[PDB]
Amino acid sequence: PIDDTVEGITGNLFEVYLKPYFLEAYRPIRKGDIFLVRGGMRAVEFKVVETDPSPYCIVAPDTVIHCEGEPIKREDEEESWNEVGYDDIGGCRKQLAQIKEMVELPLRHPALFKAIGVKPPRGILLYGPPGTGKTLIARAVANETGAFFFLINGPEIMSKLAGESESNLRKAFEEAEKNAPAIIFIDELDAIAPKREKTHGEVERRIVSQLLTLMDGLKQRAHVIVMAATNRPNSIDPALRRFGRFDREVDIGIPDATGRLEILQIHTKNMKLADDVDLEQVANETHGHVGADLAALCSEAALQAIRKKMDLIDLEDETIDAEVMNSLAVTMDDFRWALSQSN
Amino acid sequence: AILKQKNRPNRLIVDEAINEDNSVVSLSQPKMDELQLFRGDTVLLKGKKRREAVCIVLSDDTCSDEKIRMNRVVRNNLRVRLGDVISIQPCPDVKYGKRIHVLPIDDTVEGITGNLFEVYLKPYFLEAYRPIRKGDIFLVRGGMRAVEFKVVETDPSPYCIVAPDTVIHCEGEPIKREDEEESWNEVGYDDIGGCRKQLAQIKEMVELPLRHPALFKAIGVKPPRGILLYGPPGTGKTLIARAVANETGAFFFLINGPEIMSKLAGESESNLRKAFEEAEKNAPAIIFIDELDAIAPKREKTHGEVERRIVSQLLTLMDGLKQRAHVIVMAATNRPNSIDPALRRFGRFDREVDIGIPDATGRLEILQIHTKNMKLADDVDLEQVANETHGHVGADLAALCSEAALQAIRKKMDLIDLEDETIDAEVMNSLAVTMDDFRWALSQSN
Amino acid sequence: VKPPRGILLYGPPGTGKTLIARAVANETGAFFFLINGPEIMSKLAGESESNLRKAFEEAEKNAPAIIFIDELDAIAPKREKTHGEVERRIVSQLLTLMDGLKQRAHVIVMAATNRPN
Ligand SMILES: Nc1ncnc2c1ncn2[C@@H]1O[C@H](COP(=O)(O)OP(=O)(O)O)[C@@H](O)[C@H]1O
Ligand SMILES: Nc1ncnc2c1ncn2[C@@H]1O[C@H](COP(=O)(O)OP(=O)(O)O)[C@@H](O)[C@H]1O
Ligand SMILES: Nc1ncnc2c1ncn2[C@@H]1O[C@H](COP(=O)(O)OP(=O)(O)O)[C@@H](O)[C@H]1O
């Protein structure tokens, strides 16, 4: 096992995870592979450290599986446990395909731009209501392209004494440059760069100004894309749209029925769902909901299902166990219960 | 092998009292049948930390089969919270006591003079045949307060029935309140009325995080971490948060909105961060933010840049909450529109509860809570009071109950001063609050 | 039981609100501490707040006591009519002290203003 992926799990991991993964699947595997198994409301990772015959084989009913040894450290090994990817994003294929194509050359073929005199986009603005996956998108793109990611949180910047706010912005831009190819994501940009109509006082003006200066200095630091998120165009300072600052915009709207379904599948992929769970129904009835609503919904049904079973658990003096967690089905009733609350 | 049945039928989930008495527990009739217990039997209850208690069992027609209704006194004696499990068995062993020793808990009798013991203990035990256990702490109400006693010795030991013939000894050093686990002056769900649905929601919301925290190191699901309570002033939002902390055994840290804003800048922000660090170090914990709109108003209604910094500092701390296990932040305000809508983002205040104004039945319940330490004359009709206080909230009715108690005391202070009289436990406990006293309070304007 | 701890007197100027508070102190043998609204606000910030807290500490040490706040609206106006952040701090300091009053026996705070609004 990879250590961090099994922290907080107790019981026979190996029985609980490995058996249903391999059972009658005849998976071919290679020495050195890392693989991911889902269940018990989490995901677990294992390394294949040895195989016989070597260095590959099929894992068949007769194949014995040894798990004794020192757990593998997650830092020594290149895997994606808990790293957001495009497979973690649903319901917005077109816009993700645009962002992809936009950052392809700069992030994946950076050395190109020392050879040619064309300017890549350097600033992309993502619009859409809250909970629509704008942070997730930026992170996914960094991970999926191997780029460095630096998050700037809008509120965090503004929570500082003046000069500190400005020093922290500049530090962010210096760091992305030193680790480039890099994406700088500015969460809640409108906290930092509102319009002049809605500005109050002069530290606030200084800080929008500092941001625009840094955006203008971006063409001089290769190969940094700045992505930034806000509720709508009208919030923010329109000077941010100037050529060579945020010169590209993407509208991340609200998912439709098919997108919601996809979102629900993503947010239930670590769960055991009973046969009566009809995610298509759930998707059909959640009109107007966004990705954060449906993740909240999935968490709420999982937790209702656990509360049901904690009583029975405490009645028999039971401790919570990998076996317990993995056998525990979330049912349609659990989802119906979450769908019927108001909050 | 060393066997013992698992899934025993005498293990029950503890649930709230409907009948408020220190000596009674309630099961469902089918459970009693199954366990061969009968109405009025003595039962021995086992809880956490090897604690035991003795009680009278009754049938309740709303108790679920797997549950037991017990009041807060008994729970503390057992070291259980609502939702924990106990075991129950017959105790037909229990004899009329020859003698018992009790001591008062010190803070609970500070400021009372006269024969406490006569005034409190006699009416508590008189012809009630209460079973009691050595080590029990119990609460007695009267004379506009509540008093606590420990049972330090019993004969026969370690339990008996307190019967007419039972002698009660009270000489000794008073017990210190710090050495002892009881709820004098601690707000609980029994101190809250008229909002059952919303309290049941909050309960279920915080159940797993506060009561089963180790769960969340095992699973990758996110619990709610921020709950916002809406409703007019005086509606018990602070009381609710406190009750939930107490009833779940969680640490409570109150942040007062005005107090934060009364500081020099940087201090306000340092004080917020300190609050969040403290709750983390003592977690499971609830942070309650009283008058949140003092701290995090909307940008339309902001004035200047220390005020922006301070909303910003709060949102940053809320975002850091997923990194500090297992802290719920509850916060209170007059309505959604007051506050900064960035507080509603996923992973900040992602749950809202509307604590509205109680109805007639809720008011009645509120009035009963706020008169439980008083002697009320027979003519006191709390249902009338409840019917006529349309639109009032919990703070209005508590004020009303205080105002009637005080009017009743002013009536009697004159007669008291006419005879050179000093105020006494005896005086306070015999002093009835009457309907006239409540009618008088109902007829003022303030 | 909780006694009232704060009483607000409304009415036009010249209607004897200061006189009433003083009369009540004298007639009950209570200590009287007058806080003048304008006087508080005439100070550097921090001083205004220190002076409020000092007033409340003094009434507590000499209790039973009445604190009378003359021209309260100089000190604690509505948020619509507030200007700037020393003014917010000072209303805030007052509300904090009022909340601390249940912890200091036996202090009534009386305060005077032209109207609720
Ligand atoms: N399109 C989506 N697919 C899957 N999950 C999503 C999607 N949109 C939002 N979510 C979920 O809801 C959460 C809201 O996250 P976030 O990316 O912070 O929203 P935003 O940046 O737009 O406020 C995400 O972390 C993810 O869990
Ligand atoms: N639902 C209720 N049940 C019993 N008492 C209540 C209720 N609501 C308010 N009160 C009483 O009125 C007081 C008002 O308290 P508080 O909880 O500070 O109100 P809020 O937080 O909504 O302003 C409480 O301390 C309690 O004495
Ligand atoms: N009801 C009253 N009876 C007698 N004198 C009064 C009355 N009201 C006001 N005055 C007189 O007018 C003065 C105005 O005083 P003050 O109490 O400062 O008014 P306020 O506090 O309402 O501004 C008093 O000092 C007293 O001389």
Residue numbers in the entry:
A (entry chain A): 118 to 460
B (entry chain A): 15 to 460
C (entry chain A): 235 to 351
Show sentences the authors wrote.
As one of the most abundant cellular proteins, human p97, also known as VCP (valosin-containing protein), has been assigned an ever-expanding role in a variety of cellular pathways. VCP/p97 is a homo-hexamer with each subunit consisting of one N-terminal domain (N-domain) and two tandem AAA+ ATPase domains (D1- and D2-domain)234. Connecting these domains are two linkers: the N-D1 linker between the N- and D1-domain, and the D1-D2 linker between the D1- and D2-domain. The functional role that this 22-residue D1-D2 linker plays in regulating the ATPase activity of the D1-domain and how it affects the function of p97 are the aims of the current study.
The notion that pathogenic mutations are not the cause of lower symmetry crystals gained further support by the structure of ND1p97Shrt bearing the L198W mutation, determined in the present study with ADP bound. During the crystallization of L198W ND1p97Shrt (residues 1–460), AMP-PNP was added. However, due to the instability of AMP-PNP under acidic crystallization conditions, ADP was found instead at the D1-domain in the structure. Consistent with our hypothesis, this pathogenic mutant without the D1-D2 linker crystallized in the space group P622, containing a 6-fold crystallographic axis that, just like in the wild-type ND1p97Shrt, coincides with the molecular 6-fold axis. We superposed subunit A of L198W ND1p97Shrt hexamer with equivalent subunit of R155H ND1p97Lng. While the structural alignment for subunit A is quite good (rms deviation = 0.78 over 429 residues), there is a significant misalignment observed for the two adjacent subunits they interact with. The C-terminus of ND1p97Shrt has its ends at N460, but a few more residues from the D1-D2 linker can be seen in the ND1p97Lng structure, ending at residue S462. When the D1-D2 linker is missing, the side chain of R359 is well ordered, interacting with bound ADP in the neighboring subunit, as shown in both ND1p97Shrt structures by well-defined electron density for the side chains. To reiterate, the multi-structure alignment of ND1p97Shrt with ND1p97Lng and FLp97, all in the ADP bound form, showed significant misalignment of the adjacent subunits leading to a side chain displacement of R359 that cannot be ignored (>3 Å). This displacement appears to stabilize the side-chain of R359 in ND1p97Shrt, which is disordered in both ND1p97Lng and FLp97, by interacting strongly with the bound nucleotide, resulting in a symmetric arrangement of p97 that is defective in hydrolyzing ATP. Similar to what was reported, the construct without the D1-D2 linker (residues 1–460) retained only 2.7% (0.31 nmole Pi/nmole p97/min) of the ATPase activity of FLp97.
